Design a protein around this ligand. Structure first.
Ligand SMILES: CCCCCCCCCCCCCCCCCC(=O)OC[C@H](COP(=O)([O-])OCC(O)COP(=O)([O-])OC[C@@H](COC(=O)CCCCCCCCCCCCCCCCC)OC(=O)CCCCCCCCCCCCCCCCC)OC(=O)CCCCCCCCCCCCCCCCC
Ligand SMILES: CCCCCCCCCCCCCCCCCC(=O)OC[C@H](COP(=O)([O-])OCC(O)COP(=O)([O-])OC[C@@H](COC(=O)CCCCCCCCCCCCCCCCC)OC(=O)CCCCCCCCCCCCCCCCC)OC(=O)CCCCCCCCCCCCCCCCC
Ligand SMILES: CCCCCCCCCCCCCCCCCC(=O)OC[C@H](COP(=O)(O)OCCN)OC(=O)CCCCCCCCCCCCCCCCC
Ligand SMILES: CCCCCCCCCCCCCCCCCC(=O)OC[C@H](COP(=O)(O)OCCN)OC(=O)CCCCCCCCCCCCCCCCC
Ligand SMILES: CCCCCCCCCCCCCCCCCC(=O)OC[C@H](COP(=O)(O)O)OC(=O)CCCCCCCCCCCCCCCCC
Ligand SMILES: CCCCCCCCCCCCCCCCCC(=O)OC[C@H](COP(=O)(O)O)OC(=O)CCCCCCCCCCCCCCCCC
Ligand code: HEC
Ligand code: HEC
Ligand SMILES: COc1c(O)c(C)c(C/C=C(\C)CC/C=C(\C)CC/C=C(/C)CC/C=C(\C)CC/C=C(\C)CCC=C(C)C)c(O)c1OC
Ligand SMILES: COc1c(O)c(C)c(C/C=C(\C)CC/C=C(\C)CC/C=C(/C)CC/C=C(\C)CC/C=C(\C)CCC=C(C)C)c(O)c1OC
Lengths: 352, 431, 125, 55, 352, 55
């Protein structure tokens, strides 16, 4: 139950309760998804309707996001109404009703729409494939719900019991006076939460390499590569990501997106090549793999990768910061590949 | 929450914020798409694209700088982001590109590779971004044969016929000093930046003023871009709104908040305190909608936009929405006004104070260019809270009741009735 | 008349030992004279459904109860048209005549009443 | 589909008199309506014929 | 242009024109499919309607099947009407109209229904996955059409030009007098067909091993293994297939289906484990792989595998027959695996 | 939906007189129909009032 904060003379504060309940910890396929969608529904004392009508009159909104590792319950509002949103977030974690009718009428539909939107963007169909093949069952678990395996109202309740505990969450308030925040968190129902265990394992995920998957799709074609990084070897990959996604690299116009997903026990590097016809995709990637196998860096973007990694003001709790001003050379060992789209006209791991 | 601005030769404006991590510097010109002609339309968008070109962008990247630019109707802006320490190296890159390289960025190999990008860009926009494509056309017909009608990204026809001489012609007429404002947001002090600027002299085309024109005017009209192959219907509708620096800038913005925005798929959105939702949710009249009070120098647009798949009930969608707007003149309640006040503050807050200096730069430059100063967030709230039901009623009775409208739509719009039908709903029968 | 109102009055009488011993015996006699049980129906099956509250309620009713309500209603119409009653061993027993839909009806009414309250809330500065 | 369903005039007759779904249990008390239509016809017919001889 | 036959005193004859145009030779994804579906449509002298009305009055029907290698145009009819069905089949190969409206109104729909039916049977989703991973682009080509890559009316015409030639087809008549059959084939338009090349390559397909693919599915779960066989080493696998699918093997009740697909240049062995819940699938297969790794045979089913391989009277042109009475021992080297269904609860290639 | 659409009686009026989709180009020759309804009314009204005094 870590209660962080940071005041300021601004009028918009933003409470947030991070929790280690994302897909990485999901007991059944998509259960984390359902729960993120079940948040802010009915509690035992306040209805989803009253909650909204009230917060609107005060001047604030709620939102519940789903990461591969987290389930964040954020709340944006006016400064002086702090306690209200503290108890509101408190109420959700401790006593959401979970009525059988809310599942069929609000949750499932909202969830079905989420899966649908993602089922149409090929890059995400790819990113999901990368994780599934690198980390075969940890962070490789399905992010969203799709009904392949049963998930009852009870299964959603059990997972709530595990994840929503004092030893598995962390309160964080932006533009809030820490004195009052700590006072209210303890004065609320947060402290009544049966503090169980923290599922944050430090042992590095057992990743694989030289794995590939191909998925037929009607739309834009996409070829992507996935690379498992180390707990300390991630700071170099970060500059690489900003290098390939910049004016300095010549092949920045040959890739759609490139990034480094940072976790608490390692990470994953992703590179995306997306285009309408398969021919341009096969070329642009066959070129990237070849130029990266004959690696180079010299860290000219050492000040760009540091500047771009600072614009993230919501991440003022990021891991290593000065590890950048060290290594400056990149190669290309083994990685992972996925073909999505016009399969019969796309490269294989071999010819790369 | 400090708005500091001083004039020596160049009008310098800054808004410091200690904890920031980064800092952004740049210039913002008091001329945008509303200053172009039907034939050189798209020049400003082109400038933005070369200023961000691979060549120029690689130079600032080595230095650890990031580039950003935005073309609007009344203004234009070029910004360079950096760390709190290199607040000087940004000023070098700024002057280097606007004086030294104001001829190197325009080579016959760069301009041709850039022109080929904006062409695939603007084309892509017209082929797929339907909601924005429609809102752009709304301005097009609402203000036809007048400044605000020119689309910011420019037309594919005025674009493919644009030459380097046009860039220069525009630049030499608008990228002047008397029509500029150097902005600095992030963490750097007003006195920190002003010094690094008053150091390097040189006026470069001083005393010169941009050309004048004819004032923007609203015209009740419509443009229907029917396309039965699209899976939805996107329509935007509006009346003549309020210009920036208008006694009702806020009443209007509040009036739009009353109906606000909606997304039929987000559970919480369905629960909002908007009466209109009782009417549209029965038969699911639309996937989403959003009201707005767009403001510019000479005029504005007050209305809403919506997207729907219920192509056989579009008349009910439009009918219910316009019946709700009728209420603003005769039966709006105190609690509706109050719900709006709170929500307006929340959104106006999240805009004026986010964790991104580039947004702050644009907002700061844009405002200081039109009213010679920026209105503090706290000063706004005082005005917002002062609005009574009587204010809304007087405003609506002038802007909404029995007034011409502008319409624009694309997709399956066969169900959108004729002009006079929609137009008639801007009022109600009475004894 | 709402079921919330019926419950208020009914519960008040049910708790007080004064009325509870006076009324219930009359009510039990009333229910037997009604005769709906001889047609295989449970009282809740008789509630008029053509209104939003009842449609919400029947929609939330679990599958197994729904199929059963359906069989009871059809069976009732067939007996009625033949101008007979079911054989006594098929009659609904008092233990069976449970208010199975009532909890769904009351939940919907409260939800409805809240919305009515919230749509009309005044504000005092 | 059957002609009684497709024809503009016959479909009205079909929906009101032929295919109209009735509750299986209605009793003879539900027969008064038709009896009222019959009465209306008898009144109109006999009335017009007498009107021919009435002053 | 091989014209085979075989008379008999029966009243039902059956002409058939086998052609090497299946998916294995498909230039674009599913084009063979479209063509099989485009058969018996309109010719330049006879409409699909007249063709049917006529054959009905005579007493015979037509049908066009699609294999992984063939495209068979069969015709069942009464004996004495032989020439008619010869010219009918002749007309189709030489002059089908290919009208733009027949594609949109009859072909595409019929094809869309085919893909739909197969998209619901998990064993086939598996069999298709086996071929795709073993033979990465030969017999691993998509059997049916699904629109991932464009296929115009012209592409269907080009592929018809290649495949429909005298050097790529073979007439075969069951219950027909060879004398008359040869006489009519030459007297028809068959001989006018521009005899091109035979795409029947003898060089063994370059197969892969130790490959695996996993597909999420809502329905029954299925785990299957695919094994590439040799041109001569296929006769042993055949008895294995009949062994596992018989009373002699103890694990016959643990597998749904097992077979050996025989081609002209090798083959593929398939084993299928299908069930509702994932647990029973994981077990039954983990047991099969283990018991097969400790191989045994002794060929007790040597007379059963020979008897079952004789009931196929339509295949009186099968490859090796007496290769069975030889080898009698089986092991289990490297193979291929595919998980379809409840993925998060199914075995991986590793734990097998 | 609008009341004119949902009400059993008003929808008839709506579909025939209010929302009925007409071809944009019809000319004044298409105005005779309504004129015929008007004539029918004028004949019935004036006729009933005279019938009150006729033998
Ligand atoms: C000065 C004052 C004068 C007074 C003037 C009188 C007013 C006359 C004006 C109206 C006359 C025409 C109206 C006829 C229908 C009115 C009756 C009615 O609706 O009763 C329904 C009522 C409902 O029946 P149900 O529940 O649907 O029937 C189950 C049948 O057994 C189901 O069985 P089923 O379909 O298989 O067969 C049914 C039955 C059907 O029989 C019928 O015709 C239909 C029902 C008529 C019952 C008799 C009514 C008496 C009228 C005189 O046929 C029968 O075998 C029954 C025969 C009954 C005897 C009728 C008298 C013959 C008299 C010859 C002269 O039938 C009755 O039980 C009648 C109750 C008596 C009511 C009288 C009140 C009116 C005063
Ligand atoms: C002893 C024998 C006695 C004989 C008795 C006579 C029989 C009377 C019984 C029926 C009387 C009521 C019927 C009225 C409608 C009949 C006319 C008709 O359908 O013509 C359509 C015809 C079609 O017009 P359109 O193509 O749809 O119109 C384009 C308009 O310019 C589009 O323009 P707009 O809508 O913007 O404005 C249109 C126009 C609309 O004007 C109208 O009122 C509608 C059309 C009427 C034209 C005049 C007909 C002459 C009747 C006497 O208004 C005007 O400014 C035009 C003024 C025309 C002069 C009318 C005479 C004033 C006389 C004062 C006494 O209008 C004509 O061109 C009339 C042709 C003459 C036909 C006469 C054959 C009947 C014998
Ligand atoms: C008086 C009847 C006048 C009959 C109309 C004459 C005529 O020519 O009818 C032609 C019509 C064929 O029309 P039809 O086949 O449906 O369409 C063409 C191909 N699709 O053929 C028909 O319309 C045949 C219909 C014959 C039934 C006539 C009357 C049935 C009586 C019930 C009337 C119902 C409407 C009541 C309206 C309200 C009255 C107050
Ligand atoms: C004579 C009219 C008598 C009016 C009926 C009286 C009445 O009580 O009407 C109640 C009715 C409300 O009904 P309603 O709101 O639609 O449904 C309940 C909630 N869903 O309210 C209504 O029905 C209001 C409708 C008023 C319009 C009356 C007449 C319109 C004239 C056109 C008639 C069209 C039908 C022509 C039929 C053929 C005639 C030859
Ligand atoms: C005026 C009322 C007097 C009606 C006179 C009754 C006619 C006697 C019916 C004879 C049956 C003939 C037959 O076999 O038909 C087979 C024919 C088809 O038989 P099937 O192949 O075995 O199904 O059935 C009919 O169409 C019967 C139609 C009878 C219509 C009588 C009208 C009844 C409604 C009464 C209300 C009227 C007032 C409203 C105004
Ligand atoms: C009997 C025919 C004589 C009709 C007398 C005409 C009435 C004069 C119209 C006055 C207009 C009033 C107004 O402003 O309405 C606004 C009102 C709404 O206006 P808005 O808000 O600007 O759209 O419009 C109407 O409803 C006009 C309705 C006119 C109805 C006249 C009937 C015309 C059809 C003729 C055929 C009749 C015979 C068939 C049997
Ligand atoms: C002209 C057509 C006509 C219609 C239509 C008509 N009637 Fe009559 N009705 C007459 C005439 C003529 C008389 C006078 C002759 C008579 O006394 O029966 C009359 C007389 C009457 C009488 C007096 C009966 C008596 O004691 O002599 C009543 C009551 C009556 N009508 C009821 C009705 C009812 C009820 C309807 C319709 C639902 C109706 N009428 C329809 C023409 C008509
Ligand atoms: C009772 C109602 C009544 C209706 C309904 C009615 N009429 Fe008449 N009509 C009369 C009467 C009464 C007279 C005799 C008085 C007169 O001469 O006008 C008459 C007379 C006539 C005449 C003779 C006019 C003359 O020269 O005196 C004609 C022609 C005529 N009607 C046509 C029609 C037409 C056409 C309609 C309807 C479409 C119609 N009527 C409907 C009652 C009616
Ligand atoms: C949902 O439930 C229903 C149900 O819907 C229906 C319809 C019925 C059946 C009953 C009916 C349809 C009754 C309907 C009655 C009418 C429509 C009557 C209409 C009335 C009229 C008076 C018509 C007008 C007649 C004329 C203008 C002509 C008469 C005059 C003539 C022929 C003069 C001829 C002159 C000369 C000189 C020869 C049910 O039994 C029922 O029960 C469950
Ligand atoms: C598709 O195209 C169309 C179209 O569809 C229509 C409908 C119209 C518009 C025109 C019409 C709808 C005409 C319709 C006319 C009628 C329905 C007339 C019906 C006629 C009647 C005579 C009604 C009967 C009246 C009575 C019974 C009452 C009269 C008597 C009274 C009030 C006696 C009162 C007594 C006392 C003592 C006070 C168009 O112009 C058109 O053009 C493109």
């Amino acid at each position: 139950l870590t209660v962080s904060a940071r005041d300021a003379p601004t009028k918009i504060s933003t409470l947030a309760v991070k929790v280690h309940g994302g897909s990485r910890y999901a007991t059944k396929d998509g259960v984390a998804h359902l729960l993120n969608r079940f948040n802010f529904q009915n509690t035992n004392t306040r209805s989803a309707l009253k909650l909204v009508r009230e917060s609107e009159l005060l001047g604030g909104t709620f939102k519940s996001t789903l990461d591969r590792e987290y389930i964040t319950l954020k709340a944006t509002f006016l400064k002086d109404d702090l306690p209200y949103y503290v108890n509101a977030l408190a109420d959700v974690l401790y006593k959401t009703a979970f009525k059988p009718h809310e599942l069929t009428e609000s949750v499932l539909p909202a969830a079905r729409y989420d899966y649908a939107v993602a089922e149409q963007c090929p890059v995400k169909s790819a990113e999901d494939q990368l994780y599934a093949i690198t980390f075969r069952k940890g962070l490789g678990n399905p992010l969203l719900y799709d009904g392949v395996e049963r998930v009852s109202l009870q299964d959603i309740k059990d997972f709530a019991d595990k994840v929503y505990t004092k030893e598995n969450l962390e309160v964080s308030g932006e533009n809030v006076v820490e004195a009052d925040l700590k006072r209210f968190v303890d004065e609320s129902l947060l402290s009544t939460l049966p503090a169980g265990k923290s599922l944050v394992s430090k042992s590095e995920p057992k990743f694989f390499l030289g794995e590939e998957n191909r998925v037929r799709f009607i739309g834009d074609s996409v070829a992507a590569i996935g690379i498992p990084v180390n707990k300390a070897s991630l700071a170099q990959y970060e500059v690489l990501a900003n290098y390939l996604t910049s004016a300095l690299s010549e092949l920045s116009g040959l890739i759609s997106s490139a990034k480094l997903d940072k976790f608490t026990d390692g990470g994953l590097f992703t590179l995306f090549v997306r285009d309408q016809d398969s021919a341009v995709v096969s070329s642009n990637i066959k070129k990237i793999v070849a130029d990266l196998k004959k690696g180079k860096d010299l860290s000219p973007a050492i000040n760009y990768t540091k500047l771009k990694n600072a614009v993230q003001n919501e991440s003022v709790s990021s891991p290593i910061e000065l590890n950048f001003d060290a290594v400056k050379d990149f190669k290309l060992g083994k990685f992972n590949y996925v073909a999505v789209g016009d399969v019969s006209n796309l490269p294989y791991l071999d010819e790369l | 929450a400090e708005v500091t601005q001083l004039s020596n030769g160049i009008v310098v404006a800054t808004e410091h914020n200690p904890s920031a991590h980064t800092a952004s510097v740049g210039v913002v010109f008091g001329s945008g798409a509303a200053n172009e002609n039907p034939y050189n339309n798209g020049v400003s968008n082109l400038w933005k694209n070369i200023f961000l070109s691979k060549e120029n962008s690689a130079v600032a990247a080595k230095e650890g700088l990031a580039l950003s630019s935005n073309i609007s109707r009344d203004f234009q802006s070029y910004i360079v982001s950096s760390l709190p320490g290199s607040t000087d190296k940004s000023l070098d890159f700024l002057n280097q590109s606007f004086i030294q390289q104001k001829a190197n960025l325009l080579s016959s190999s760069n301009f041709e590779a850039t022109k080929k990008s904006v062409l695939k860009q603007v084309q892509d926009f017209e082929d797929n971004d339907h909601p924005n494509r429609v809102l752009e056309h709304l301005h097009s017909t609402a203000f036809q044969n007048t400044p605000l009608s020119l689309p910011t990204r420019g037309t594919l026809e005025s674009l493919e016929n644009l030459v380097v001489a046009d860039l220069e012609s525009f630049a030499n007429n608008h990228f002047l000093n008397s029509n500029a404002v150097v902005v600095g947001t992030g963490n750097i002090k007003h006195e920190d930046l002003v010094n690094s600027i008053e150091s390097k002299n040189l006026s470069l085309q001083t005393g010169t003023k941009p050309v004048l024109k004819k004032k923007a005017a609203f015209l009740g009209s419509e443009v229907r871009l029917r396309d039965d192959t699209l899976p939805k219907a996107w329509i935007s509708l509006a009346v003549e709104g309020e210009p920036v620096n208008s006694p009702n800038y806020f009443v209007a913005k509040l009036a739009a908040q009353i109906f606000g925005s909606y997304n039929a798929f987000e559970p919480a959105s369905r629960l909002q305190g908007i009466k209109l939702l009782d009417n549209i949710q029965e038969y699911q009249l639309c996937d989403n909608f959003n009201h707005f009070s767009l403001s510019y120098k000479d005029s504005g647009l007050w209305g809403f936009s919506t997207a729907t798949r219920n192509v056989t009930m579009i008349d009910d969608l439009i009918h219910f929405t316009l019946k709700q707007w009728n209420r603003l003149t005769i039966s709006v309640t105190d609690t509706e006004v109050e719900r709006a006040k709170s929500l307006l503050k929340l959104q106006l807050g999240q805009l004026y104070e986010s964790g991104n200096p580039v947004n702050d730069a644009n907002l700061l430059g844009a405002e200081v260019l039109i009213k010679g100063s920026k209105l503090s967030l706290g000063e706004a709230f005082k005005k917002i809270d002062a609005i009574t039901v009587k204010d809304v009623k007087a405003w609506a009775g002038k802007r909404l009741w029995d007034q011409d409208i502008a319409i624009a739509g694309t997709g399956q719009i066969e169900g959108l009735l004729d002009y006079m039908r929609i137009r008639s709903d801007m009022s109600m029968m009475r004894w | 008349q709402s079921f919330t109102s019926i419950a208020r009055i009914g519960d008040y009488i049910l708790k007080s030992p004064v009325l509870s011993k006076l009324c219930v015996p009359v009510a039990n006699q009333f229910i037997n004279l009604a005769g709906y049980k001889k047609l295989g129906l449970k009282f809740d099956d008789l509630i008029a459904e053509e209104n939003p509250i009842m449609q919400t309620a029947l929609r939330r009713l679990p599958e197994d109860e729904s199929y059963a309500r359906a069989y009871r209603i059809i069976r009732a119409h067939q007996t009625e048209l033949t101008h007979h009653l079911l054989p006594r061993n098929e009659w609904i027993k008092a233990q069976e005549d449970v208010p199975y839909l009532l909890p769904y009806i009351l939940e919907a009414e409260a939800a409805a009443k809240e919305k009515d309250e919230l749509d009309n809330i005044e504000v005092s500065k | 589909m059957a002609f009684r369903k497709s024809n503009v005039y016959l479909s009205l007759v079909n929906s009101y008199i032929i295919d109209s779904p009735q509750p299986s249990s209605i009793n003879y008390w539900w027969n008064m309506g038709s009896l009222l239509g019959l009465c209306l016809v008898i009144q109109i017919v006999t009335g017009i014929f007498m009107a021919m001889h009435y002053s």
